[PDB]
Structure 1
Amino acid sequence: GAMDYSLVKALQTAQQNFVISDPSIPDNPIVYASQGFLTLTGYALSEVLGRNCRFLQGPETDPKAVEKVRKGLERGEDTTVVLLNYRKDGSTFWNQLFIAALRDGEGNVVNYLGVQCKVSEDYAKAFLKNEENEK
């Protein structure tokens, strides 16, 4: 199960915000989210299980950030981005996402793991400027 991964246990010891998705199910829904993620976003565990985590995005989310994630997942690459997300009540926050594939012995992706960090406006600005300049 989700909490059987040693890196998941490690993240829990530090109370990180993370989710686990299941890409064997159509549209790669969330199948676990940590308490920090639920408090951050305003959703109960049962309500987020079964949703693709794109439910956190909205009209002011930059589609280029989303596309970078999409392509990373497609290309088998670790991906790190900052993008605007939305709580259940419509309020917004900047979210730094760290996404990786969890793989079996033959390389098959068995789950994805995504760590989330709420960051300040100032930090999001600095990060996105660096990302751009580095491009």
Structure 2
Amino acid sequence: AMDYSLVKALQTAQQNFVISDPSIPDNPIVYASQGFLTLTGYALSEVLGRNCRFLQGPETDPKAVEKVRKGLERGEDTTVVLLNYRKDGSTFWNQLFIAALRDGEGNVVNYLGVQCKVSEDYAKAFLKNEENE
């Protein structure tokens, strides 16, 4: 990974994460941790140069996808819970944490996304609580 100290910190905990490069059209993945590859069932060669939206499918809530899109557009750290699909078509609940990695002038150089698999019970409680705003 472009070796930011926070990326090295996530590697020591064997977290699931990807790094995107917004200078490339459609803000594709340029790095994916072994944890992300094992969670999703994809080989690194199948993920590099693609936008992470390939994990979405028919049971994914498009309103959770829209929260991510608007968060990035507004330059905000974003946390959502949404249903994602593995390569084999099995589904899981993904608590997704996205941050901009910025230079000294505040320009976004990369996005960092951490995926945490959560239970259906946890996802329902998170989404119910989100809806009380």
TM-score tier (shorter): over 0.9
Q: Give CA deviations for 1:28-82 in whole Å, capped at 9, x if unaligned.
A: 0000010010000000111101110000000110010000000000000000000
Gaps of 5+ in 1: none
Moved segments of 4+, more than 2 Å: none
Could you tell me how far 1:99 is from its partner in structure 2? 0.2
Backbone CA RMSD of aligned residues: 0.7
Could you tell me how far 1:3 is from its partner in structure 2? 3.9
Match of 1:19, SS state, is: strand
- Whether the 8 Å contact between 1:23 and 1:29 is mirrored in structure 2 is yes
- Whether the 8 Å contact between 1:3 and 1:9 is mirrored in structure 2 is no
Match of 2:18, SS state, is: strand
Match of 1:4, SS state, is: coil
* Cα distance between partner residues in 1 of 2:112 and 2:82: 17
Could you tell me how far 1:133 is from its partner in structure 2? 1.5
Match of 1:133, SS state, is: coil
Q: Give CA deviations for 1:74-119 in whole Å, capped at 9, x if unaligned.
A: 0000000000000001110000000000111111110000000000
Match of 1:77, SS state, is: coil
What is aligned with 2:68? 69
What's the TM-score once normalised by structure 1's chain length?
A: 0.97
Equivalenced residue count is 133
* Cα distance between partner residues in 2 of 1:44 and 1:128: 30
Higher relative helix content:
1
Percent identity at matched positions?
100
